[model samples]
Target chain A: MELTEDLNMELRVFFDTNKSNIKDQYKPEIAKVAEKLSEYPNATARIEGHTDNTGPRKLNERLSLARANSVKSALVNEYNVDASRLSTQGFAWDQPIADNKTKEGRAMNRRVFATITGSR
Target chain B: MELTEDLNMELRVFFDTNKSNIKDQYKPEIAKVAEKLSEYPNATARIEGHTDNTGPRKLNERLSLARANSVKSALVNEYNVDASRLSTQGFAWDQPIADNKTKEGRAMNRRVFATITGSR
Candidate 1:
């Protein structure tokens, strides 16, 4: 009976080529985002890895998965998020938010993305 | 850091063979679920249809889609859910939660399932 708004948010955590470490600069902000998930007692997130189109397919797949797992670990260990509430996947260079071409585009392409799911 | 728990729910809406119409009995319960999405602005749901391995593959696919769309329309039209927040898919006997050999199992297979996603 009241006006409603969309609740979904797009989450991205950038990574350098072949690297899975979380940057010091992004930690605080990511922690804040993790707090949002805490607001909903049962919320879960799917953390997926994406890479720019480069290198061997299989290598990219492994690198992407490592990146995703890195973020998953930070969420669980550093942010106090539940291990079971998060799922991880690696898409290699399959799903890209930016073009794989330009410098900035490639940078954007190499990242981890999160999708949150929950019941009311 | 604090202890946290997983927060995910699987939803099932059963349908009769070859029928896409929703039964009146389910309307009330589903309406309650519609209210849940309303609580979180921007929350989205993926509605998928499944069927028993009885009919032609293509026919089952179409029937499954119709069933998913049927639920989509109800959430949008009857329960005032945002149409944009819903997406539909049809998996004709590809992913069965139960054995498809018996009548009860078949009935369970002829159903629609929902997955909801959202941010804080």
Candidate 2:
């Protein structure tokens, strides 16, 4: 399957400021997500989970870690994306998007960056 | 008012390796995305675009730039995200996730990281 598609599920998967219901954000999206990475067996990936400064740094880090692991789980179980080529890290607002006072900015700040490396 | 949801549309948006037809992946998905960044008045964001090594560095950079701009445009126009609080850059596989020899890896390599970096 070509990954030239979007992860559209139900507009219900987002990180709430007090967001702790992790599954609520990923369950639906994983199905819509095209697990095309499975096609590239030799490639590796890293999931960098980030968050806004809504919570404590330590808490946010833990939250981000959970979020990253959740994403990783979806990819591995649903999309069949390999687990070996993936690593996850959490950055709790350490690298903000420059601002967090605005609603949009905080939302954007809480993001997951999935990067891939290796020969193509 | 909260971005605690998912971008659920019709599951028809994604970047193909030879992905030139831009609007398709975004047009549908934009509607589902909540522009929560607009709420944070003092916040700022940066969209870092990246791509796999499937093409030349210059070309990949341009492609990544386009992808980043598209995301920015969607946020600005569709979700009412402030244009001023955001900046974008293109990274052509400069920092791969670790591998790209497989479809799974390359898919992850080709990513766009939206980082928040201002007050909360």
Candidate 3:
């Protein structure tokens, strides 16, 4: 069974989000899971990137994708997660996980968040 | 039964594009037609906004819509086009009458473009 609650979760996933670039940060959550992934090699990580509705629709969609890619890249490169096991998507200001309205207005501002699901 | 080539040329439509803001220009192509629409008030001007693949998918889509709305505003106000007769849609990076490469530097194959349908 899929853990839908796990997606909402006490288990945290983090990223160093840029406007249209991916994050290359390391967090314990991803590392632990990715390490465990090596044991079950045929698993997939569903990377879902999120942002606030604060900018252009095009860039927002692309940025969300870019962020998801960034996370996948980090997991594949840094953690033991296999490249074949990562699937990514950008949600684009639709499901915000976010901040004060004042937050999205600073500069190249948006509240970018992400999550992943695994078929173990 | 329809002249689609008439969609791309012999007609000069102008728009100013930002990340998602409409450019304010008064080219005769749209102005003239909108003025004519005022005479009938029953016909519609189909406005399509386009863009390039050089940006995010969501923002690109929104920007295209934004552009169409801007044109509708211009026709309604300056050119006396019927307000109810104007409909708009954003084509995003799908249709291209113009391009980013534009015989310029890089070949940004992805771009946004639009067309119009008439009840005349």
Candidate 4:
């Protein structure tokens, strides 16, 4: 039935400036991802963390990792997705989906999202 | 006095062909990394998984993720490192440390390592 293939969705869990902790507002989206993970046991997700080009490259890199790890923690601790089925990347200021010249663009850049790595 | 800076070490946990599971022979090295993690509470690590150029790119990518996740799992579950302090990446034969044309080089390519992302 292509259970794993059917579990396709986007989760742009945005964050505040220099923040890695998940806010309450993003809980619903994370919950939806958790539900999908449960539905497709074979599927695995790689939580990608990113940052704006406003900070030092090394710190920005770490910030992005923190963002990704925060989401991975939620999937495991809050929603019970198997930890082994998740991984993370910190792409600091790279692969931005929007322009970083505007406040909104910077906001969009400072975010984390889940990419389906593959199935078991 | 640079407590977080001194936790630098190389961990090339090589894997058998077509395998993602961590063998016991490499547990000592993983344990050393875990110990360093425990000592440097502010430090965070990004476990990088990689594969030899022997398979499909997509599958190699997933295999690398699996290898990285296995290491992350050991650090968190067995070594008690905080999951929030860890992240992962699957390079999929993109960043090879050795030649993939020889048996020894291919063995080196099929491996995972911990990169200290940064300190909090």
Q: Write the per-residue lDDT of candidate 4 for residues A16-102, one digit (tens) a residue.
A: 999999999998878877776776677788789999999889999999999999999999898888899898989999889889999
TM-score of chain A of 4: 0.88
Runs with alpha carbons beyond 4 Å of true place in candidate 4? A1-5, A117-120, B1-120
Query: In candidate 2, what are the lDDT values of residues B20-93, reduced to their tens digit?
Result: 33455556444433333433345566676778888777899798887677777777876787788768777777
In model 1, which regions exceed 4 Å deviation?
A1-120, B1-9
User: What is the per-residue lDDT of model 3 for residues A4-113, given as tens digits with 9 covering 90 to 100?
Assistant: 11111112333333454433343565565565456445545667766566667887788777767777777788875668777778877776644526554322233333
Candidate 2: lDDT of A26?
60
iRMSD for each candidate structure, in the order shown: 10.8, 9.7, 26.5, 18.6
Candidate 4 lDDT over B34-92, as tens digits, reads 77676567778878999999988899999999999999999999988999888888999
Output the lDDT of residue B114, model 1. Answer: 83
Task: Quote the lDDT for B98 in model 4.
Answer: 92
Q: Give iRMSD, candidate 4.
A: 18.6
- The ten-residue window of minimal lDDT in model 2 chain B covers B1-10
Q: Judge candidate 1 against the unseen true structure and give its global Cα lDDT, from 0 to 1.
A: 0.79
Q: Supply the TM-score for candidate 3.
A: 0.36
Better of 1 and 2 by lDDT: 1
DockQ of each: 0.02, 0.02, 0.01, 0.01
